[model samples]
Target: WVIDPSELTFVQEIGSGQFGLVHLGYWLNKDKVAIKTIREGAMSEEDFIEEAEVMMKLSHPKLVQLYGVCLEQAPICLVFEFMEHGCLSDYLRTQRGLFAAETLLGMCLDVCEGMAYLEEACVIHRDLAARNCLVGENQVIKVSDFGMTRFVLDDQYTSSTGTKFPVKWASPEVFSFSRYSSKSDVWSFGVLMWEVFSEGKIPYENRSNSEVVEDISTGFRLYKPRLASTHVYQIMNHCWRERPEDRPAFSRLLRQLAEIAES
Candidate 1:
C-alpha cells in the first residue's frame, strides 16, 4: 500500500539500516511507524519493490512487518512497524544489569522462532546478529532488514576477498570460501547470542580479522559471557561448531529455546 508523503512526518533519524537511513515517523500524523528510505544506487526501484512484495507475503509475529511503500520518487520509502525499544544491541547495552536471565533467554527465543520461519521460507539470512534485530512492544525482538540488499549488496558483502564481510559474526566457511547457507546463519546466530548475553559488547573486539581468522581456524571460540548460564552458553556453543552441518538448525534451536523457556 502507498502512503502519501504529505501525511508522513519523520520525527527523528533513528538509525541506519543495511539499506539506508531509518527514521521514526508517523503516518497520517498519528500512527507510529519506522521508515526505511532505500539508497538510490542499491537496486532498480522496480526490482526492489517487487522483491519487497515477495517478502511482504511472509507474515509472522517475530518478523518485522512492511506496512507501506512510497514510490512517488527516486528514493523508495518503505514503512515498517516502529520498534520502540530500538535494536537488540542498543537495548542490551542501555539496559544492562537490569535484566533477569530469563529475560535474556526470552530474547533468544524470539529470534530463534523468527529464524526458523526464515529458514523454512527458502531464505538464508546470511547476516544474523543482535544489531539486525529490533525490540518492539513488550520487548519483542523481530527480524529486520531483509530482501532489500539480497540482490545488490550481497555480492559485495558475500565476497571473502572484499572488506564488507564482518569477520567476527561470520562462520569460517564465510571468510574461508565465501560460502553461505542457513548453517552459516546458525553460526552468526551463536554470535548474536553472545552479543545478547554479553549485553552488546563487540565479539572479539580486541583482535584483528586476520588474527581472528588464525585463532578461529585453530578452534578458538569466544569467552563465556558473565551473564550467560552454563545452559545458555551451551546453546550458543552448539551453534558455533566448526562444521556447519554439526551446527543446530534454527528449528532445533527453537525447540531448545522453548524447552529452556518452560523452566
Candidate 2:
C-alpha cells in the first residue's frame, strides 16, 4: 500500500539513533504506525528502497512487520507496526527483575525463533543487540534494526572494510576478518542475552572498544550475570566460542531456551 506523508499525524518522536529518527504516529487517522525516515543525504534512496522491499518480504511473529514504504518524497520513509513498549534495553533497565527469570528467557526464546527463521531464509542480521529488539504489548520481543542486515544467497557475507560494527557484541572472526554468517549473529545473541539478564548493563562497561577487542581476542569473556543461572550462562558461553562453527545454531538455541523457560 502506498502511504501519503500528509495522512500521518505525528504523535511523538519515539526514537533516534545512527539509523535515523523514529516517530510514533496515527496513519490515516486510525492505524498506529512507526515511521522511520532516513536523515537527508545519510543514505542513498536506492539502498533505502532495497532494504524496505526486503523487509516487506519477511514475515514472522517475532519480527517487526514493515507495513510499507513512502518513496514519493525526500528522506525516504519505511512504515512499520508500532511497538508500544519501545526499545528492549530501555525497558529492561526500567523494569529490572520486576518480571520472572522465565519471562526474560521467554524473550530470548522469541529472538532465537526469529533468528532461526532468518538463518533458514539466508539472511544475516549483522546487528543484533538489546537496543535493536523492540518490546510490544504482551511482553513480546521482536527483532528490529535491519540497517545492517543482508540477504545472502550463499549464506555468508564478507563485509567491506570500514563498515561500522558493534565491537562489544561482535564475534572474534567479525573483528579479525569481517566475515558474517548465522553463527556470527549467534555471538551477538549471546551478548544480547547477557544484557537481558544484567538488566541492560553495557557490555565491557568501562572497557574501550580496542580494549574489549584485545581481551576477546585473548579468550576473555564476560563473567556471568548475577541474575542468570549457570544453565543459562552456559548457553551464552557456547555462543561466544572462538570458532563460529562451534556455536549452537539458532534452531538449537530455541529448543534450549524453551526448555529453560519451561523448567
Candidate 3:
C-alpha cells in the first residue's frame, strides 16, 4: 500500500494518456519530480512488467530518463526527470499563438538527435508518435513511452500476442516481422517528420489503423513533411524506402540531417 495522496502534493497535472496520467509531484520530504501512474483499475500484471522493462532499459537524450519505478502496488508508477514544457505534440499544436519557424526546426533537430542516440543504443522505439515526444522549456525533445519498444535479436522480433505497437509509424519490414533493425527505426523517424511538419497531425488522419497497416503492407508510403527544403524531403523518402535494406543507416541519417541543418 502507498502513502496518502495528501503526503504527495501535486504541483500540477502534466498530461493524460490512454493508459496513464502524468503529474508533477513533490514528496513529503521536499523532493520534486515527475510521476506517471497507470489508470487506477485498467492494467494486468503482464502489462505492468512490460512497461517496467521498457522504462528501465532504453536511455537517450531525446528519450526521457527514468529515475526509478515502484510497481509493488496495484496501480503502477514510474518516476522520471521533471520536464517543464510537456509533450512536443502539445507545444507544436497549442503554442502557435506565439510560435516561430526557427524554434520549430530546432525542436525537430532535437528529435533527430534523439533518434540518433537510440539507434546507437540498438533499440527500436517501435512507437514514435507525437504524444510520446515530450519537449522541455528549452525546446529539447525527449522521446517517452517505450511500452511498445522491441529489441532485435537474431534477425527477428519474436514477441507474443497483444502488443499493440503504433502501426502509423511502422515501416514495411515491421509488417513481415522479418527482422527489426536500425533502418526500421529510421523509417519511423521519417513518419515522425510528417507529424512535426503538419503540426502533430497523425499519418493517416482519416483512415483506420487497419487501413494504415494495409497501406504499409502494399507500399503506400507517406509524402515527406514540408520542413523548408527539397533535401529534407529526399532524406525522408530515403528512410521510407519499400525495402528495409535500401534505407539509409543512422550514420548516413545523422550526416544528412546535419548537412540540412547547416544549409
Candidate 4:
C-alpha cells in the first residue's frame, strides 16, 4: 500500500541498523507505527521495493506487519505496525524478569510458530536472533529483520566469502562453508534461546569473534542459562547438534516447546 510521508509525524529515533534508522512515528496523525527509513545510497531502490513486496505478502501474528511503503520520499521508508517493547535483546537486557518464565516460553513459542510458517513458505531467515525480534504490546514477540532473508529451492543457500555474518550464532557449515538453510537458522535459534534465558547476555561472552570461530570449530558449546531448566537446555542442545540434518525443524521444535509450556 502507499503512504504519504506527510501522514507520518516522526516522534523519535528509536533504533538504527545497517539499513537505516527506525523512528517512532504517528501514522495518519492517529496511530503509532515504527518507520524504517533506508538511506538513499545504502540500498538500491529495486532491492528495497522487492523487500517491501515480500513483507506485504507475509501475514502472521508472530511476524511484524508492513503497513505501507513511502518510496516517493527521498529516503525510502517502510511503515510497520508499532511494537511497544522494542527489540527483544535490548528489552531482555534492560527489563529482566519483566515477564514470568511462562511468558518468555510463550514468546519463544511465538517465534517458533512464525519460523515454522516461513519454513513452510520456503523462506529462510538468515538472521534469526533475539536482536532481530521485536516485542510488541502485551509482551508478544514477533520475528523481524528480513534484509538477509530469501526464498530457497531445496531449502539451502550458499554464501560467498565476502558476505559477513554473525559468527557467534552461525552454524558450523555457515561459518566454514558459507552454506545456509532452515537448519542453520535452527542453530541461530538455539543461540537466541540462550539469549532469552540469559537475559540477553552476549553469546560466547568475553570471547572475540575469532575465538568463537575457533572454539565452535573445536566442538565448544555454551553452558546452560542459569535460569533455564534442564528440559529447556536439552532443547537447545538438540538445536545445536553439529550436523544440520540432526537439528530439529521449527515445526517439531514448536511442538516440544508447547509441551514444555503445558507441563
Cα RMSD (angstroms) for every candidate in the order listed: 2.3, 3.9, 5.2, 4.0
Query: Model 3 segments beyond 4 Å from truth?
Result: 1-9, 27-31, 40-60, 97-101, 147-165, 224-227
Residue pairs clashing, model 1: none
In the range 1-263, model 4's lDDT, one tens digit per residue, is: 77977788899998787668989988885578899987765545675566665557878898988788887758888788898888899999898866578877787899999899888887778879898899887888999865444422112222423234478888988888868888998999999999998888998878876788888888889999878889999999999999999999999999999999999
Candidate 2: clashing pairs of residues:
none
Q: Which candidate is the best by lDDT?
A: 1
lDDT of 1 by residue, 169-202 (tens): 8899888987889999899899998998898899
lDDT of 2 at 213: 82
> Which has the higher lDDT value, candidate number 3 or candidate number 4?
4
Q: What does candidate 3 score on TM?
A: 0.78
Computed on alpha carbons, the lDDT of every model, listed in order, comes to: 0.84, 0.82, 0.68, 0.82
Please, what are the lDDT tens digits per residue for candidate 2 over residues 100-217?
A: 8888888889889989989888888888999999999999999985544443211222243333446888898887887888999999999999999898889998887678888998
Candidates' TM-scores?
A: 0.90, 0.89, 0.78, 0.88
Model 3 agreement with the true structure over 123-204: per-residue lDDT tens digits = 6666676778887766778777653443222122233212454566777667556356777778877877777776766678
Give the C-alpha miss distance for residue 34 in model 1, angstroms: 0.8
**Whole-model lDDT, candidate 3?**
0.68
* TM-score-superior candidate, 1 or 2: 1
